[model samples]
Target: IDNFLKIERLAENDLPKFIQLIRLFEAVFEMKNFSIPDSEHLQKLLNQNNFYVFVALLENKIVGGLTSYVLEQYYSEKPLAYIYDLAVDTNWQRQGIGKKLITATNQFYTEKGFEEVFVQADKVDDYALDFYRSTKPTAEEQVVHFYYTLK
Candidate 1:
């Protein structure tokens, strides 16, 4: 795996590679219209250990990535892992990059003693649903998501 794709945790010194990861995310999520944070702020975020970003690089160029946060639960001492964004470049899709990214994330958090990692997929996104299901997560169906806008 290391020969074809190198997976590594994003660090403060990796601002340029992190930006490439963000661009890949923007392309996947149609978020190129939004303004991205500057390198300084991004470096600050990367310094925080609870926020994790892992990127899959092929020959030193980012081809896929996943961003997740560790949530401290009041009821328990162990933090919960929540994967917020994951994507592989369009041309690189269906090539196991996405799965490799998730596996790398799981290995990272597992070593930290986090029992479970959670992610959400819109019902309309069959590809995402299939991907998540392939990971064999415990499915929850009764709940509908709700959001409140501050504006």
Candidate 2:
């Protein structure tokens, strides 16, 4: 359906605006146990070959973003699309911007011959889990995720 607005690929030079968009995500993360990397860290990651960045634009401004990285593991024998960070500005939530941004990224992965895309959402955020469930393959049974922190 054409009901949703535009979703576009963001270039490296657009870091300033993208950083601003990420600031909104940082704010949301502050309400929980999430931490975001600084701009220099992000830029270093972006310099890697398989990093993909996409943003959703409404009225010529970024309102949502999806950042994914392709990882090749010897155990898997293929590349996987790992969605590390995804966020939509508070003002744009529930307006389909997040879904639109995800669709665009999925299409990008599919076109590149990647069949599996993985995302890990904080179990504390039901809305985010629901969004991913609606967009991806779902599980019939409940699952628990464990995380380890390093210094």
Q: Best by TM-score, which number?
A: 1
Instruction: Return the TM-score for candidate 1, rounded to 2 decimals.
Output: 0.92
lDDT of prediction 2: 0.75
* Clash pairs, model 2 backbone: none
Compared with the true structure, what per-residue lDDT tens digits does model 1 show for residues 10-90? Answer: 987888888999898888888746898888898888888789999999888899999999998887787899999999998
Candidate 2 local lDDT, 56-114, one digit each (tens): 77666777788888888666665789988888877778887777878898888888778
TM-score of 2: 0.78
Q: Which 10-residue span in candidate 1 carries the lowest summed lDDT?
A: 135-144
Q: Tell how far residue 149 is off in model 1, in angstroms.
A: 1.8
The parts of candidate 1 lying over 4 Å away from their true place are 140-142
Once fitted onto the true fold, the runs of candidate 2 whose alpha carbons sit more than 4 angstroms away are 1-4, 31-41, 75-77, 136-144
C-alpha TM-score for every candidate: 0.92, 0.78
Backbone-clash count (model 2): 0
